Amino acid sequence: GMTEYKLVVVGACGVGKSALTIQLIQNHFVDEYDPTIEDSYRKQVVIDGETSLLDILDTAGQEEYSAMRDQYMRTGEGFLSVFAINNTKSFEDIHHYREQIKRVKDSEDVPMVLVGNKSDLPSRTVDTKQAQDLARSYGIPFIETSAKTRQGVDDAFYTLVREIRKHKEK
Ligand SMILES: *CCC(=O)N1CCN(c2nc(OC[C@@H]3CCCN3C)nc3c(F)c(-c4nc(N)cc(C)c4C(F)(F)F)c(Cl)cc23)[C@@H](C)C1
Ligand SMILES: Nc1nc2c(ncn2[C@@H]2O[C@H](COP(=O)(O)OP(=O)(O)O)[C@@H](O)[C@H]2O)c(=O)[nH]1
Ligand SMILES: [Mg+2]
């Protein structure tokens, strides 16, 4: 059989949401992707032996708190909270995205995964230990990724699918 998953990639401008989603979907790195383009991208993959249709929302629109916007974001079954390891502000911004997800879901148990992207760059400003401690504080997994080299990309999205699955079995 198969299961579909609405996954949502969030995080500050430029952390690599689009590059991560395109790597997952098409298996290459897109270095210039219009920062304004918001769209969903589909991938079929087997995860732990079950066909999984991933419907991935790559967010990009202006910060907006309308009923329509809240209701759309609520459709996400799981969220990737993406920051870039050479951008400490994107790391601090993670709490804002977690908070907003919690708000529209009116739940403290939303499937989420913390993703530290750009792990191929030497210019790291976010300690891996710090990022691990943050995810532990949320009770969610942490995965270091590079959309450029594809390191950890499968692990990040598949972990999120697994978190949704567990939240179901619960
Ligand atoms: C380069 C353009 C780009 O990638 N984006 C990404 C989306 N986005 C954005 N930004 C913010 O906040 C920007 C900063 C941090 C806090 C102060 N502010 C100035 N917040 C966003 C969101 F909260 C959401 C969002 N919106 C609603 N209504 C509900 C939910 C659950 C969310 C969430 F993302 F958390 F899922 C969105 Cl969709 C996008 C946000 C810009 C940086 C533009
Ligand atoms: N070195 C490196 N650059 C990346 C990586 N992911 C994204 N980028 C670059 O970072 C910038 C923003 O990426 P983009 O996907 O547009 O970010 P978004 O605004 O979160 O969608 C672009 O210059 C990308 O080429 C990565 O893993 N490594
Ligand atoms: Mg983008």
Author numbering: 0 to 169
What wording appears in the published article?
Here we present a 1.90 Å resolution crystal structure of KRASG12C, C51S, C80S, C118S bound to divarasib. Following molecular replacement with the apoprotein, electron density in the switch-II pocket indicated an adduct with cysteine 12 with an interatomic distance of 1.83 Å being consistent with a carbon-cysteine bond. Apart from partial density for the Gln 61 sidechain, the switch-II loop is well defined. In the back of the pocket, Lys 16 is positioned 1.9 Å from the carbonyl of the acrylamide to form a hydrogen bond. Tyr 96 sits behind the core to form the hydrophobic base of the pocket. The quinazoline core of divarasib is positioned to form a hydrogen bond with His 95 while Tyr 64 and Glu 62 extend from the switch-II loop to form a lid. The pyridine also coordinates with Asp 69 and Glu 63 via its primary amine at distances of 2.1 Å. In the back of the pocket, a second water molecule forms a network with Glu 63, Arg 68 and the pyridine’s tertiary amine. In contrast, divarasib reaches to make an interaction with Asp 69 while maintaining a hydrogen bond to His 95; a unique combination not seen in the other drug complexes. The most striking observation is the distance between the Cαs at Ser 65 which is 5.6 Å in the sotorasib and divarasib structures.
Small GTPases such as KRAS are composed of a G-domain and a hypervariable region that cycle between an inactive (GDP-bound) and active (GTP-bound) conformation. The G-domain is responsible for binding nucleotide and coordinating effector binding. Hotspot mutations in the P-loop of the G-domain such as KRASG12V, KRASG12D, and KRASG12C perturb the normal equilibrium by inhibiting GTP hydrolysis and locking KRAS in its active conformation. In multiple types of cancer, a missense mutation at codon 12 substitutes a glycine for a cysteine, causing hyperactivation of the GTPase and enhanced MAPK signalling.
